[PDB]
Design a protein around this ligand. Structure first.
Ligand SMILES: *[C@@H](CC(=O)OCC)[C@H](C[C@@H]1CCNC1=O)NC(=O)[C@H](Cc1ccccc1)NC(=O)[C@H](COC(C)(C)C)NC(=O)OCc1ccccc1
Ligand SMILES: *[C@@H](CC(=O)OCC)[C@H](C[C@@H]1CCNC1=O)NC(=O)[C@H](Cc1ccccc1)NC(=O)[C@H](COC(C)(C)C)NC(=O)OCc1ccccc1
Lengths: 306, 306
């Protein structure tokens, strides 16, 4: 029993974190086989973070412009190239701790673990959702750039995020490991703001199923709803519209609990309209939207506490 | 910016997790140097979990009664002994991945990271506080026994918890790494219940400081309180009494924000009496009590957003 925001074990990722220095700028890099990946803003001049031309900045660099440190060991850079908003540095040594890995671009509403890092040294690990507005609600300080997000399946690490910047609202923006930003953001310190965010409906429903699996039914009701009638309410409360695909994704959780998806939607409709009446769900006074259906299945028992 | 429940990176601990089997019972063990530590209830007969006499059960075992698996490698047991509620198994191989480590008994209100494990395989990592009633609000399923809790300072792992049991309320009980239970619990399936819990006042105050450091002041007020007058209110709302030692611990956070501890106590008094008026603090609609002053200092900027 219990239900916690749970990150993946971070060991396979810790073995890949290095420090990258260009001029007086230091940030984190990710070392896989003979390549080190890092945010390309490491090459920005101290004087110009507003209008960098990265092609013009990079052509002025040699391999020995870049210093790469893995623990106390210096890695010699033997090649470099830009890929979108990252740099790919070739080094003289393949990382002996390289795990089985893939690069994946995650989708809005999906979750991942973040390994917060400073000066190539891992400091903490926590779970994040990719928000509908393509930001994450992370926890990052100066020095955290190049920290990575990932998921693990069996023994394969799926890297999905590298950290680049903080927006005015205190939320975070970054790229996949091909260097393409999540959302409309750009790596320059020109004024940018996160779009309006939305509550991840699918995740709220998954979490209500988690609550039932774990033994709590207080918030259910005798009613049902149509998908379209639910969506009228969803719009009012700034929830994402529910789709048939989302209904199908919830099949396994529905089956384990014996609660039809549209019946759980009716329960959710009532919670939105009436509130929770001073009660909690899985220890929460609010409706949680950062657990996916996959996350619920991973963490909860396969046997419902009936 | 941001504020998240953040666990320590788990790699140093993952390298120590093994599987221990006696008869048909399998659980997790912790492998450090040439010793494997695990819950002694691994030796319980399938028929008797109510009244085991562990001395009588253990004397009936040989070294080869115990099977220890590290990944796909079998570790030969060459000695065994009971220490309180754990078994200490001596094995033929010292763990080459043994980190610098200490065993520490943590105190109520303090936090640690839990590495949830099944069949010797780490599955997830999350942060827990030791509750005043000596339980933790974990997330554990069948097979999780022997999962460990820890903190990390510099490169030293301070192990503080090994998991043994779940109580009727869905909360968790276990031992330190000397095998002594936290709280009045015993490792037998005789009826037991967690004592009434209390809110960790020191942590709530630390978290209010975190909110100020990160830029939010909405909940402050023009008032102060005496320690004793605060405690009258604390009793009413089931908060731990605040002591001068707790006031002294909050010195550094008070200094960084320019908010005197008793002034923050007045702010907290008002929040208890009046509620939060539909507002949130660090994204929370309630008062969070699972971040210590140390946790706040670890995670927040050393510069207040004034
Ligand atoms: C990682 C690098 C670093 O630490 O540099 C030293 C400050 C850092 C990660 C953030 C630090 C605190 N929390 C974080 O998540 N990233 C940066 O500082 C970004 C650096 C950069 C990006 C692109 C080109 C060149 C440099 N910059 C930002 O995150 C910046 C905010 O700066 C700080 C110092 C306040 C964090 N964000 C930004 O410029 O957003 C666009 C914007 C929005 C509104 C007004 C102006 C600009
Ligand atoms: C770890 C071992 C395991 O998985 O065994 C197979 C079930 C497991 C961890 C819990 C599983 C689910 N969540 C957990 O945190 N621990 C146990 O199952 C404990 C085993 C044990 C303890 C002491 C002597 C011998 C065996 N037992 C319990 O946690 C038990 C609850 O059992 C389950 C199966 C429902 C989890 N708790 C208990 O007996 O508490 C005392 C009590 C309270 C009220 C009425 C009767 C007894």
């Amino acid at each position: 029993s219990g239900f916690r925001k749970m990150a993946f074990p971070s060991g396979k990722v810790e073995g890949c974190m290095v420090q990258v220095t260009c001029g007086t700028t230091t940030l984190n890099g990710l070392w896989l086989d003979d390549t080190v990946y890092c945010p390309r803003h490491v090459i920005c001049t101290a004087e110009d973070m507003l209008n960098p031309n990265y092609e013009d900045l990079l052509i002025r660099k040699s391999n020995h412009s870049f210093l790469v440190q893995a623990g106390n060991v210096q890695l010699r850079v033997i090649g470099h190239s830009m890929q979108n908003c990252l740099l790919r540095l070739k080094v003289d040594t393949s990382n002996p701790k390289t795990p089985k890995y893939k690069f994946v671009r995650i989708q809005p509403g999906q979750t991942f673990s973040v390994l917060a890092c400073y000066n190539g040294s891992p400091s903490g690990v926590y779970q994040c959702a990719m928000r509908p507005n393509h930001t994450i609600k992370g926890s990052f300080l100066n020095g955290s750039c190049g920290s990575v997000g990932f998921n693990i399946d069996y023994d394969c690490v799926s890297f999905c995020y590298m950290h680049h910047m903080e927006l005015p609202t205190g939320v975070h923006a970054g790229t996949d490991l091909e260097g393409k930003f999540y959302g409309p953001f750009v790596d320059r310190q020109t004024a940018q703001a996160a779009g309006t965010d939305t509550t991840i409906t699918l995740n709220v429903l998954a979490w209500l199923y988690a609550a039932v699996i774990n033994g709590d039914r207080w918030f259910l009701n005798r009613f049902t709803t149509t998908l379209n009638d639910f969506n009228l309410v969803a719009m009012k409360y700034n929830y994402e519209p529910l789709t048939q695909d989302h209904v199908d994704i919830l099949g396994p959780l529905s089956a384990q609990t014996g609660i039809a998806v549209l019946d759980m939607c009716a329960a959710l409709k009532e919670l939105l309209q009436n509130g929770m009446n001073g009660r909690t769900i899985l220890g929460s006074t609010i409706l949680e939207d950062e657990f996916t259906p996959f996350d619920v299945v991973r963490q909860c028992s396969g046997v419902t506490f009936q």
